[PDB]
Amino acid sequence: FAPDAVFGDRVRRFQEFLDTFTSYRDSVRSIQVYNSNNAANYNILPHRIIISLDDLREFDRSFWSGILVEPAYFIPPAEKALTDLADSMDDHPWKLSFKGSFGAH
Amino acid sequence: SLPAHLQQTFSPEEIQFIVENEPIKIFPRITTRQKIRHTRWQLITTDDKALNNMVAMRSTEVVLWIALLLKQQSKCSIVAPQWLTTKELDRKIQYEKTHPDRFSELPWNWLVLARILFNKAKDDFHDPIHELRGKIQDLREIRQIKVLKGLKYLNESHLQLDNLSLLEINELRPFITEIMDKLREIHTASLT
Amino acid sequence: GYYDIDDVLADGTEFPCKFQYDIPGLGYLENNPGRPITKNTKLNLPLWLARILAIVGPVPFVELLPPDMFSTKVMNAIKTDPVALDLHSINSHFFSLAIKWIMLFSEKELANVVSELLLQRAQELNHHASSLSITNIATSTFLLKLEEMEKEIYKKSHESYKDTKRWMFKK
Amino acid sequence: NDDDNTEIIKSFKNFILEFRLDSQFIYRDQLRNNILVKNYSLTVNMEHLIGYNEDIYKKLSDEPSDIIPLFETAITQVAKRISILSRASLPTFQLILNSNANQIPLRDLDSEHVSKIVRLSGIIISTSVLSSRATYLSIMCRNCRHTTSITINNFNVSLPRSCLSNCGPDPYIIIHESSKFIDQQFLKLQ
Amino acid sequence: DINIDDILAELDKEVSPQQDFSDLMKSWKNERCSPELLPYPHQLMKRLLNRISMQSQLIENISMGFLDNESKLPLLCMETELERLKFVIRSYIRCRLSKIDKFSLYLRQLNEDENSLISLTDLLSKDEIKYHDTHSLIWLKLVNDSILKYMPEELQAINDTEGSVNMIDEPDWNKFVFIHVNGPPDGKWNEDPLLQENEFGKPCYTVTIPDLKEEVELTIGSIYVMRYEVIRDLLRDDKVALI
Amino acid sequence: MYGDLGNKLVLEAKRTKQLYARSNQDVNLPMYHEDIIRNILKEVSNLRKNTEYLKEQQQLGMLDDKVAKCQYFVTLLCMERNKRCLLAYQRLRTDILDSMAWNNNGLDTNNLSHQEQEYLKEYCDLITDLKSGDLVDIDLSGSLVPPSDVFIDVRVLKDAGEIQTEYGVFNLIKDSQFFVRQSDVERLIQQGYLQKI
Ligand SMILES: [Zn+2]
């Protein structure tokens, strides 16, 4: 098993997650338009999203437990997919944050 | 009127009592068959004939509690059932290792009878008893792994446990029935 | 069972009720027999009472608000890590109360989640019940996080294993 | 050397699998019961090890720092054999020793006791935080990315000095994602 | 070759105390594990108690003959036989007395219900009828004087079925039990109507879990954990037995 | 509030259940909670007086089709709850007394109510009625551990002198030891005079 061979599938699964729970797309676009307005109007929101980890569990438990137990192999594809989502919005690497129900962690 | 711990299961002693009612093959060391050229057994729970017609080292079959009562004295030797030998137990171990899902078809009394005969008839085995104890231990350990795998699939509906021993069942009974009962109660509560 | 003591105790736990009518004289539930209860009064009542006032009315006399023990917070905590969760600290009778709540309001989601919780905890409970001395701290911690329902199942199971081990090894 | 190590390991596997008193296989049962509650260790009474085969205890007491790792390895193999179905993972089990040998008071321990098993008593005056020690290092060469791994046993270790087939003067680095670690604590006994 | 096994069979063909003890063992094993109070084997128990009396009198007579060839071993087997047999009857009766303790009000309901297909004197022994009646009266007197004297006339009934919780405890009919699928008590698989072929051509019974609307094939000679109600009539006909 | 004393009483019930369930012997059951029971019974009498007051005032007619219906239903439910708590407590102590009857008396009295004392007497009379009737050939009050051995060694734990049995005697000399039929000494093992197996 080598991580690179599964990176693409992990990317598209997190992309499907972000497409499903569209509140994260709305958050990305809200940050972008806030920053664009404040850049032009002459203070800046960061390129960071807090995902409810419960949403990622209810979507795909395997990927969720991947984020929890093997983040070194699961956060980079998730952040790549998020950066690609931000790129897909109209006109820098985006980062992730987590909330909820960590259990034994 | 029935103790709390006997309410819905058998004690291990009761399991032994059940197993003790099985017939077993013995070599008598007394002669009771009278020649043509005195007390008879006169039982009511089991067949009287074999005990009344014993001859020394003509092997014959009697109920196990009588065989043990005779083997408490020197007056008998209890022949091990064919499965309780090194080669046969090794075949069952290989079956258990080869078929992860199934339990091997050891007889339902196997742990109980192994315990009984290793303690009360330690000198009657053709095989060295330390190897038989070792292989009985191998079997119980492997079967316990399979039990743990099985408990991952408890249901509100039913379960199947093809060749599990009477003692293994009785050990698990006040857990499996309780958990499947509570899964049923959760499930049926949801129905309109 | 009618005389099942752990059921009598579970019925004694309290749930959030919202009254749907202005009713004189019931103010003793609000600790004063001389005043009415009013519509949209929000009050905690024992389940043996709240179960009934939520069905008799027509609009029933009480609506039962979602209790915290079945809130989205607790359900998410259940759905991540069933064995690590301290159900006893959530509610000592959580399974009996979940069964009663599922029966009172037919709710497939909660029935599934509570079934999943019970099964996944039953595995760990059987592991600690099966392990015997020849108490271990890893067992001693886990038995704190068990409900009274689960403590009963544990004692019965562990006693069965211990009795079997006793019989096998002592002549 | 590893032929003799294999024979030592097999001897300990037989000690776990065969040692029995009054119809109970106490070490098989203890190992299983420990595995169920997920503590991966075994407590061995050295009276039983002596009683089983005093040659084994002679090997152990002659040089415990080489023999204890082999005993731990034997415990892992039996652990798998009694808890995982053969042909349908666990860490390296800690060996814990119980003993009734004559105590040496703390002030008498000196150069003659170096590398010997020792029994003593005292009062713990301090307990440090849980430092992390490697059991297994994943390793690779900084230049040619030759990849290997080093298993470590904590009885007295290093990285290799130069690459195992130019790679520069001191070439190896650790890969922490596939390396494995354990808790280590310091106590001060008075 | 021409098969002849039936010809050989028609040539070869040319109650017992042991079966009674085996039926007692079956009754005891089924009673201990079932939630319901099973019907009493009236005739079997009459015969067993007769045999215990006669065997005791025999052992007495032989002991007198010894006191007033002389091998003690058969007497020892007779003595410990009667001890083992009396243990089985004792355990069986004590168990179903405990069940009567649990279901005293439900059994009273079956007695009161004129529409019932079960009469209490089918289900219970004469001694169990005595025990049920007088234990019910004595417990009822205790709680009447202690407690129910002080309740209003709305609430003095001890068998209130309409209250906020039902006072009558009944058997948990869908309680899970272990069973071994005997098949018919005869070897005549061809004679059993419920028996049928499973996949792989091995016999079975199909039973329906009514809540789940699901069929399950109880194949002969294998062990299942089943809701008691779902198997209840197969158990009534000895096609399965509780482990 | 009207449910509380019932909850106190059934918490008492649960604690005495655990007390009995932790040991192999019959633990002597704790004191009968006369005070909490009297407080509950007085509370029930007050709830009865409230129903009487209300069913009087249904002649005066205040909003009775709902309001009197509600007050009546609530106080009725309070009485049902208090009955359930009282009967749960009494049924547990009944169960433990039945257990003790079969274990010993059918072969600490201050802690019972007088109803419970005469109940225990009547229940022992019932057990003896069973083992004295038909089925008499089985000592129905005997043990439920299966007979594993017919002959046993027994060590005399307390002195009792010369006693006869069916065809002989035992002189129960302190710290003597017999080898004897178990069925001839079982009564003395139950009565605590003989030690082994
Ligand atoms: Zn290199």
Short mmCIF file of C-alpha atoms in Angstrom, two decimals, chain C residues 13 15 22 28-30 34 43 47-48 50 69 76-77 88 97 100 102-103 115 135 137 148 154 159 164:
data_model
loop_
_atom_site.label_atom_id
_atom_site.label_comp_id
_atom_site.label_asym_id
_atom_site.label_seq_id
_atom_site.Cartn_x
_atom_site.Cartn_y
_atom_site.Cartn_z
CA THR C 13 -36.68 10.29 36.13
CA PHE C 15 -38.40 15.16 31.39
CA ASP C 22 -54.41 27.10 31.64
CA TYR C 28 -48.40 22.21 43.40
CA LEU C 29 -46.38 20.85 40.48
CA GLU C 30 -44.91 24.39 40.62
CA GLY C 34 -53.08 27.65 45.38
CA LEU C 43 -41.63 22.38 33.66
CA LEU C 47 -41.88 10.26 33.36
CA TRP C 48 -44.63 8.27 35.10
CA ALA C 50 -45.27 13.09 31.76
CA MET C 69 -30.00 13.03 26.97
CA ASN C 76 -23.23 12.44 17.92
CA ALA C 77 -21.14 11.40 20.94
CA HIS C 88 -23.83 6.40 33.34
CA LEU C 97 -35.44 5.48 29.04
CA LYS C 100 -39.61 4.13 26.65
CA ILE C 102 -38.83 5.21 21.27
CA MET C 103 -42.09 3.52 22.24
CA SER C 115 -29.25 -0.61 18.82
CA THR C 135 -9.48 -6.09 39.84
CA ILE C 137 -7.51 -1.32 36.36
CA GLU C 148 -27.53 -0.10 35.74
CA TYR C 154 -22.28 -7.61 33.13
CA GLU C 159 -20.71 -14.62 37.04
CA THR C 164 -17.60 -22.05 34.53
#
